[PDB]
Amino acid sequence: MTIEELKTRLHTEQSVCKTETGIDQQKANDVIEGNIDVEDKKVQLYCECILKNFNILDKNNVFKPQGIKAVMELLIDENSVKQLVSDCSTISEENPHLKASKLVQCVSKYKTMKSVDFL
């Protein structure tokens, strides 16, 4: 993968996850910009859908380091990715939906999805 292919792939996942979840564009924009309303159900589901589609979350919402590295190593330096994995893999949340939004919130501290528009 390259950054340009990530951009294309992410746009597609955002599109399909929007129709799967019914999230309003305004709330999708908030998520993409890194402002996560972690308790909003459609935000949770949108986050979950994108992360599952990238194999960052497995079917039972377990965080997968391989999946997050495949994406983040395109965007930030190796050592920063290591720290991101160690940080965001240890989020204190057991509920799958809330875990999904909290994971996007944690990671957004490092890079937001909107990042890919600044290629």
Ligand X SMILES: c1ccc(Nc2cccc3ccccc23)cc1
In the complex, the smallest distance separating the C-beta of residue 114 from ligand X, rounded to whole angstroms, is: 8
Nearest to 117 by CA among 18, 22, 29: 29
In the complex, the smallest distance separating the C-beta of residue 7 from ligand X, rounded to whole angstroms, is: 9
In the complex, the smallest distance separating the C-beta of residue 85 from ligand X, rounded to whole angstroms, is: 10
Q: Please identify which residue in 81, 85, 98, 113 interacts with ligand X, judged by CB under 6 A.
A: 113
Q: Token pair for residue 13?
A: 């996942």
Q: How far apart are CA 27 and CA 30, in angstroms?
A: 5
Instruction: Pick the stretch among 22-30, 35-43, 89-97, 104-112 that binds ligand X (CB under 6 A).
Output: 104-112
H helices of 1-119, in order, are: 3-21, 25-33, 41-53, 65-72, 78-88, 96-108
Q: How far apart are CA 102 and CA 36, in angstroms?
A: 8
Judged by CB under 6 A, does residue 85 bind ligand X?
A: no
Q: Which of residues 13-52 bind ligand X (CB under 6 A)?
A: 50-51
Residue numbers at the binding site for ligand X (CB under 6 A): 10, 50-51, 54, 56, 68, 71, 103-104, 107, 111-113, 115-116
